[PDB]
RNA sequence: UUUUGUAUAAUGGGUCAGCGACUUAUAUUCUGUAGCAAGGUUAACCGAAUAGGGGAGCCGAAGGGAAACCGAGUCUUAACU
RNA sequence: CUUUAAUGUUUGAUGUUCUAACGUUGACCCGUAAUCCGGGUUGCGGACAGUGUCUGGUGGGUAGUUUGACUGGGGCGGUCUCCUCCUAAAGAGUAACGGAGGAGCACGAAGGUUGGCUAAUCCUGGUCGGACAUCAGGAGGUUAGUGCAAUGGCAUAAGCCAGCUUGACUGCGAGCGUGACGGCGCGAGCAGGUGCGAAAGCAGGUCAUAGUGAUCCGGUGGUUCUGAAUGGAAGGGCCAUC
């Protein structure tokens, strides 16, 4: 198991996060995706964090 | 906390209904601090609920029977 | 390893430390192969074979980080 | 020996045969590949499961240019 | 003497209106990254003890 | 008696007579029966003491929710066809 | 303020010396008529030794215990969960220390959509070029390919290429399949927001079936839900998660 668990924090200022996995060797870049925030009910860009 | 049946309001006293007037009628325990009057039975006498937390549905029954509710 | 002093003494300290680690690794290999030669033996009756000794041998594979990097050869192709 | 292991049975196969009066959303057949295909008023899940899309009798047919077995539901 | 209740089994079951018991689904404590949200979301509400295990719980809770 | 299975060469008993093994509190659930019935019933205790008092309490007539809380509805949910 | 320097200055360490605590299984006297004990003069060690509490190490000297199951007797060897095929007797299911193989992952594109395309192998000709490299046209009709075993499937392609994106969304869910249960799986549709497409529509991960671990105990972030006289807080509870 070379993939490690990472969490996609929400940039909307609220405390909400998804959780996925990422091979930090092949992809050392920082993920960002437009996902849904149930707290705000809007699509906001999520950036990865520990 | 306890629940007061509507039909229990005919067994209390000459009409005033507070916490103490119910503990005299043995309807609630001696350590009860709050109570509620829910729509469960049927009320005929014009009862005056002094301080309690009657529900919306039971409030209409008390007034329709001739009573009045306060805090 | 915070070392107090100058470069000249720390160099000798590092060399002595490396020599000690080499000796300890060699001793560990000796012990590993001896316990392996014991493991490969038979049972010789309705005897124990020592499950505790088996577990203690299996624990003895804690792995070693080779010093690595330590570049000492480079390739300049002929012209 | 070296072998001697298996895997639990998966209990596939047709569940509602021909002529069954089924309810909406009821599973009609579980399968691994696509043995039967989805016809009218039926669907196909990710497992290639065929489920009723509306209640009614099941009908099996071999329509198609490649002679493929289809499952459809009458509105009865 | 009074029947002792199984204190451990009184922290996981509540007696509902008719006489059944309700409990909390398992498999939702940790390792929550693999699990699909559809599977997780179905585990969030409470459930009812099945008829097979009802006889076993009634014995454990004589008073509740 | 124990077993798939015993005339079994599998176990036990020499024979008579006497003794010898599912009991007794408490608590809980279900059935039958009796009394009262949206009510039923007292405990300790008092008592000329199996009567009569004592209603402290316990169960039941309202449930939902983890809880605050709401209440013939309640919880989930931004809200539910 | 900035680098130090000196005497006072509390202490900290270190060593030397002393006696008064302490030791005396050194001598002498008394109780006494007694190599016990006590008391008294003295000598010698002396704040060391020794004892109490706390603490690190050693400790089969001693004590309590554990040391799995299957098994063509036990031990030795082998196995223990999950996936695919046969045994399996044309619904499901079905055992053996029966016959053959795999898993404990991968992917930020290898997912979603909108366009587009169709393989293996052989023949003939053609620079270094050949039995087989790229090119041209004929046969061939999926004998080809799939992220990794086997089976089922795939041309409307599930196989190959490109553009744009994040539905690898949140709350639910009619109704079914499968389990003794814990549980596992499939699912149209409803509400909020989103991507692609002119639109009809498709999208709640990957062609499907392996890629996994209940509870307890804790950790991290949010939430007035509670907060033991009241106002807070601690600790709990709920959601996400390790
Ligand atoms: Mg009372
Ligand atoms: Mg949790
Ligand atoms: Mg026998
Ligand atoms: Mg015979
Ligand atoms: Mg004989
Ligand atoms: Mg005999
Ligand atoms: Mg015998
Ligand atoms: Mg005999
Ligand atoms: Mg009496
Ligand atoms: Mg209730
Ligand atoms: Mg001696
Ligand atoms: Mg011992
Ligand atoms: Mg013991
Ligand atoms: Mg055994
Ligand atoms: Mg054997
Ligand atoms: Mg079969
Ligand atoms: Mg059978
Ligand atoms: Mg793919
Ligand atoms: Mg296409
Ligand atoms: Mg694709
Ligand atoms: Mg696949
Ligand atoms: Mg307080
Ligand atoms: Mg907290």
UniProtKB/Swiss-Prot annotation, chain A:
SUPFAM superfamilies: Zn-binding ribosomal proteins (SSF57829)
Keywords: Methylation, Ribonucleoprotein, Ribosomal protein, RNA-binding, tRNA-binding
A Pfam family assignment: Ribosomal_L33
A GO BP entry: response to antibiotic
GO MF annotations, alphabetized: structural constituent of ribosome; tRNA binding
GO cellular component terms listed in the entry, alphabetical order: cytoplasm; cytosol; cytosolic large ribosomal subunit
Superkingdom of the source species: Bacteria
Note: Surface exposed on the 50S subunit.
Subunit and partners: Part of the 50S ribosomal subunit. Cross-links to the P and E site tRNAs.
PANTHER family recorded: 54S RIBOSOMAL PROTEIN L39, MITOCHONDRIAL, LARGE RIBOSOMAL SUBUNIT PROTEIN BL33M
Family the entry assigns: Belongs to the bacterial ribosomal protein bL33 family.
Protein name, as recorded: Large ribosomal subunit protein bL33
From Swiss-Prot, chain C:
Effect of disrupting the coding gene: Not essential it can be disrupted, its absence impairs fitness in long-term (up to 6 days) growth in stationary phase.
Region (PtIM): 5-79
Subcellular locations according to the entry: Cytoplasm
Induction info: Constitutively expressed, increases in stationary phase (at protein level).
Domain of life: Bacteria
Protein family membership: Belongs to the ABC transporter superfamily. ABCF family. Translational throttle EttA subfamily.
Task of the protein: A translation factor that gates the progression of the 70S ribosomal initiation complex (IC, containing tRNA(fMet) in the P-site) into the translation elongation cycle by using a mechanism sensitive to the ATP/ADP ratio. Binds to the 70S ribosome E-site where it modulates the state of the translating ribosome during subunit translocation.
Subunit record text: Monomer at concentrations found in vivo, exists in a slowly reversible monomer-homodimer equilibrium. Probably contacts ribosomal proteins L1, L5, L33 and S7, the 16S and 23S rRNA and the P-site containing tRNA(fMet).
UniProt comment concerning the protein's domains: The arm domain (residues 95-139) is inserted in the first ABC transporter domain. When deleted impairs fitness in long-term (up to 6 days) growth in stationary phase. Probably contacts ribosomal protein L1. The P-site tRNA interaction motif (PtIM domain, residues 242-322) probably interacts with the P-site tRNA(fMet) as well as the 23S rRNA.
Curated annotation (Swiss-Prot), chain D:
MF terms (GO), sorted A to Z: ribosome binding; rRNA binding; structural constituent of ribosome; tRNA binding
Gene3D superfamilies in the record: 2.40.50.100
Pfam family, one: Ribosomal_L27
Disulfide pairings: none
InterPro entries noted in UniProt: Ribosomal_bL27, Ribosomal_bL27_CS
GO biological process, one term: assembly of large subunit precursor of preribosome
Any one cellular-component term (Gene Ontology): cytosolic large ribosomal subunit
Record keywords, A-Z: Ribonucleoprotein, Ribosomal protein, RNA-binding, rRNA-binding, tRNA-binding
Known partners and oligomeric status: Part of the 50S ribosomal subunit. Cross-links to the 23S rRNA. Cross-links to the A and P site tRNAs.
The protein's name: Large ribosomal subunit protein bL27
Species this chain originates from: Escherichia coli (strain K12)
From Swiss-Prot, chain E:
Region feature Disordered, mapped onto this chain: 1-21
One MF term in the entry's GO annotations: structural constituent of ribosome
Superkingdom of source: Bacteria
UniProt cross-references to Pfam families, sorted A to Z: Ribosomal_L35p (PF01632)
A GO BP entry: translation
InterPro entries recorded: Ribosomal_bL35, Ribosomal_bL35-like, Ribosomal_bL35_CS, Ribosomal_bL35_sf
Gene Ontology, cellular component aspect: cytosolic large ribosomal subunit
Compositionally biased region (Basic residues): 9-21
Assigned keywords, A-Z: Ribonucleoprotein, Ribosomal protein
Keyword Ribonucleoprotein among record annotations: yes
Family of this protein: Belongs to the bacterial ribosomal protein bL35 family.
NCBIfam families: rpmI_bact
HAMAP family in alphabetical order: Ribosomal_bL35 (MF_00514)
Protein name as annotated: Large ribosomal subunit protein bL35
Source organism: Escherichia coli O157:H7
